[PDB]
Design a protein around this ligand. Structure first.
Ligand SMILES: O=[N+]([O-])c1ccc(O)cc1
Ligand SMILES: O=[N+]([O-])c1ccc(O)cc1
Ligand SMILES: [Zn+2]
Ligand SMILES: [Zn+2]
Lengths: 196, 196
């Protein structure tokens, strides 16, 4: 659409340089099976908790870099048209089919309240094939990205949580995003986003 | 070499289902910076040697899957034909631009001795900006890839090693693949491909 066809110009493949660039960031195409295998080794080795952390932060970094890109395409787009580049880029990257349910966003006022549908989550899919169906949501990297993108664009922390997840048997994933303090457990969600 | 054009049609973007396909494998587009940041956490917390193995093994799984795909369209393709598909896929993905130097392969006879030139190793050019110049070769995931690809192709253990590598500060990377039996340290090398 207008959010994908436009962000498509920022993507160029250079088989002449063996490289891929999305905006100003170099990219690779990576086999989901390969990342699933890495997940199983990290989970089995560092535990499920330490592992989710590592994936959430990898997602965060990715979401931030795409927010930088989006911000160079500010133009005459609204806050919402700004926001929607995130879901757009997430789709182009082959991670999930993002479907915005309802978004309330003002950047200047520090107001954001967002809810999205996720169809065909790579991360849920991969997780059931490696661990089987899961107790709690598994799209760690995908959530980190949401968190990373939206914080960067708002210049303030916006944590997301998966409300429903394909990893837990549900038909899809579903997520809610809102400012850190608007979260009861928001202090400790933020803790997941720190290395040391 | 010229199989780039052919292999490149196997790669489709399926935005409707938010998914990218290489043959029958689902792929994602991932920022090298984010991958760079996971490598750094892993090196800093698990040890440089222990992270090397994790990425080698992720590479290995990637390679085995491009070999699995290249084994579906071997219509009128010499053994060198099928071998050259690895470098192309690797290049196409955006991991590295690969120059075959001297390839000697006969699958039926167990014959394989390959040397390759690597320019623009994302990995070496990522370990460059996180740990500065390294001392030992640092394109772990990339080498794992060759190893997994050719071993799947030959039906036997082909290990690769880097002779030169940008992450050590040389102009370029250069690799040598050959059967396990023709490596001085081959058995300790095959050991890295096993998970702890
Ligand atoms: O920034 N956002 O609001 C997003 C970005 C990606 C996504 O999958 C969902 C929401
Ligand atoms: O199949 N192979 O021998 C390969 C594959 C990839 C690469 O970068 C070099 C060699
Ligand atoms: Zn999910
Ligand atoms: Zn190298």
């Amino acid at each position: 659409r207008d959010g994908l066809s436009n962000l498509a110009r920022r993507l160029r493949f250079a088989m002449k340089e063996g490289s891929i660039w999305l905006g100003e960031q170099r990219m690779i195409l990576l086999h989901t099976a390969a990342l699933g295998a890495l997940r199983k080794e990290l989970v089995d080795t560092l535990g499920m908790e330490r592992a989710r952390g590592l994936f959430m932060r990898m997602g965060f970094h990715s979401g931030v870099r795409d927010a930088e890109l989006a911000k160079t395409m500010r133009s005459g787009h609204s806050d919402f048209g700004m926001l929607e580049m995130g879901p757009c880029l997430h789709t182009i990257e082959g991670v999930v089919r993002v479907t915005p349910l309802t978004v309330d966003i003002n950047i200047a006022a520090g107001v954001y309240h967002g809810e999205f549908l996720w169809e065909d989550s790579f991360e849920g899919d991969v997780h059931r094939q490696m661990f089987g169906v899961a107790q709690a949501p598994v799209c760690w990297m995908q959530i980190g990205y949401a968190t990373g993108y939206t914080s960067a664009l708002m210049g303030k922390t916006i944590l997301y949580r998966e409300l429903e997840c394909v990893g837990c048997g549900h038909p899809h994933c579903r997520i809610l995003g809102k400012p850190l303090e608007q979260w009861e457990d928001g202090e400790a969600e933020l803790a997941l986003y720190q290395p040391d």
